From a paper:
Bacterial Tgt functions as a homodimer in which the protomer consists of a (βα)8 barrel harbouring a Zn2+ binding subdomain close to the C-terminus. The reaction follows a ping-pong mechanism including a covalent Tgt⋅tRNA intermediate. Hence, in an attempt to generate a model system for the active site of human Tgt and to gain insights into the relevance of particular amino acids for substrate base selectivity, we adapted the Z. mobilis Tgt active site by site-directed mutagenesis in order to mimic that of the human enzyme.
In order to investigate the importance of Gly232 and Val161 in human Tgt for queuine recognition, we created a doubly mutated variant of the Z. mobilis enzyme in which the corresponding Val233 and Cys158 were exchanged by glycine and valine, respectively. To allow the interpretation of the obtained data at a structural level, we determined the crystal structures of the mutated Tgt variants created in this study in their apo-forms as well as in complex with preQ1 and queuine. In contrast, under the same conditions a faint band representing the covalent enzyme·tRNA complex was observed for Tgt(Val233Gly) and Tgt(Cys158Val/Val233Gly) indicating that the reinsertion rate of the excised guanine was significantly decreased with these Tgt variants (lanes 5 and 11).
Numbering used by the authors:
A (entry chain A), B (entry chain A): 11 to 111, 116 to 127, 130 to 383
The structure:
Amino acid sequence: RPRFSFSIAAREGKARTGTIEMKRGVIRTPAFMPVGTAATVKALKPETVRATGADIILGNTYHLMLRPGAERIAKLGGLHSFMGWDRPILTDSGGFQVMSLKQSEEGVTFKSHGSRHMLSPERSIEIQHLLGSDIVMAFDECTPYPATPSRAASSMERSMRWAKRSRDAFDSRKEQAENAALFGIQQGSVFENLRQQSADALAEIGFDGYAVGGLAGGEGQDEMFRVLDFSVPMLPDDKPHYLMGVGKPDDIVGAVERGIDMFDCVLPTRSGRNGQAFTWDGPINIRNARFSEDLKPLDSECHCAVCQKWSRAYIHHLIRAGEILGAMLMTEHNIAFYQQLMQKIRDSISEGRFSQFAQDFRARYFA
Amino acid sequence: RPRFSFSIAAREGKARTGTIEMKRGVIRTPAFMPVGTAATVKALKPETVRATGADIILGNTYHLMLRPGAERIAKLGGLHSFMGWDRPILTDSGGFQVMSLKQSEEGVTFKSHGSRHMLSPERSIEIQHLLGSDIVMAFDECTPYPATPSRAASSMERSMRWAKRSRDAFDSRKEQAENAALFGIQQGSVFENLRQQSADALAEIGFDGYAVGGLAGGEGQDEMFRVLDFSVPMLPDDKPHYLMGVGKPDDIVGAVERGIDMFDCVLPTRSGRNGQAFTWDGPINIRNARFSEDLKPLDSECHCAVCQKWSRAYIHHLIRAGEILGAMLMTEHNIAFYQQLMQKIRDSISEGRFSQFAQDFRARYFA
Ligand SMILES: [Zn+2]
Ligand SMILES: [Zn+2]
């Protein structure tokens, strides 16, 4: 396999389905990347993650650099080896969590959620290399929502400068430039002219993929979709389009209809432990009393191991009892659900009936 | 298979190895029963529990009657069906936890750890039937340690009266008497004459198995072994001898050398989440800093999936990060370790080299 090869096999409107070939494996797109917070996808063995159909997982640079540390993981053989996942892994830059959990043009210094740490385009790229990430995200400065035109521009402009620095830092590292891929991130908040300038900047620098950043920041689905409407088209068509931190089932469908190829969200994972189970008829809260004696599986159609062997009543009991097994089963289900969603999306686009699938999915999901 | 059939295939001193045939499966003895607190063996899927080599698990009547309730589990098809375990299940009477987590000759009434509940020989047996337990424990009155000769006698005497009531209650329930087995419990604290009277009483009533109760109550290994020395021999030889709540590896070996066939302990499970990992060279605390970069498996010889795929450094990181996966891997390992211990015990007795195995095990375990 090549370092990186994105080939589109089918299209329908702005939607695309295809594959990304990488040294560690093939990624079917549109793809959903489960989130591996601290070198683990919450409550799941990597083989179980793989069993759900995931072709790639995402790793949080921020948490990892804090515990167990980038250098240690490197000394231990890398992230893949450390956690037992031998397929592709995409790592974010850590920038978001730094702000979420002293900023300057050089970068950012911060205190661990009490140790002191620094992060910059160069250091972010380095850490991701130490982790052995297959897909590296450029380090940027996120713009809070809402943001003023002046502030959004200043952040996008800095982000673009940082993108060039990420690009150069990535290329200066032989092993990384030859075995990994680099994704740039589009900024500009909700302003079209800024998004356009950002897209132009990233394209001039040149990346293996382009992410749309700054969304899923509490603006609501409509505002997001509206921004995607004009933003994604600005991005190079022959490269993957990655929507960051967007994972609500209905958000994914809409983003794909707008040209997005990759998603990542902690929702299926986090929601799992909180008792939220995804189904084709909408999400349910398994902790609700109505499921105490419900013998049906979490979802009538799901093909995951959980729905084949356990009832809602059992999982209901496990979650309300705080039992670990509850979190295990819920999460396997949710991630499994998500993968089946992506599969249906890929099949529908490939068969030219995705628009219909989108309509059918929403009608039933929101019924 | 028959309702119950205990056959001894080999002996060495007081040690015995054989099998217990039951409707739901064969139990190889000496056996270790993992503990399923609230319809779950902490952090493990039943298939994983089975994968470790366990032939039977134990269910806590007390917790179950509280959440999700005996009647509900029955309505849902029984414990086996509820949790996904189709092999034999032994359920305690709940009496111990009632005292541990208004007593009278009729029984005991208590407040949930705030609901009010009652438990008696009849109700205990009934609940266990509702759960669908394969091996039912007679309901008794535990005697605290230390206990006076007068108090120990009074409790043993009541326990013996309650044993007869458990026996009769069990027999009055057709389905239960025909598909399940009943174990009586020997009491008498550390007094030989009381233990003898207790053994005589239980034998006159007649049970499918005899448990030695009241031990593992903080008396220390020596006192326990000393009590076993004269207690186990009082029990009928052609029936299983079950030591309750004893599971430290070294305790098990010694109890088997004294004629015990069955063990149950929450140690491998509880210790798992606390970071204690069992190895043939003694237990270790994976949370200790010395394992931060240790790439070896939890145990050099273990054949469990955990030791085949993950390092101490990884599990070290998971436990210190409070990650669920840490508890999952630790517990699978510990239970796997325990099953391999029982296998080695069964093989050694079967080959007439158990005494040597006991010596070799202790020498290395305490090295
Ligand atoms: Zn499912
Ligand atoms: Zn192991």
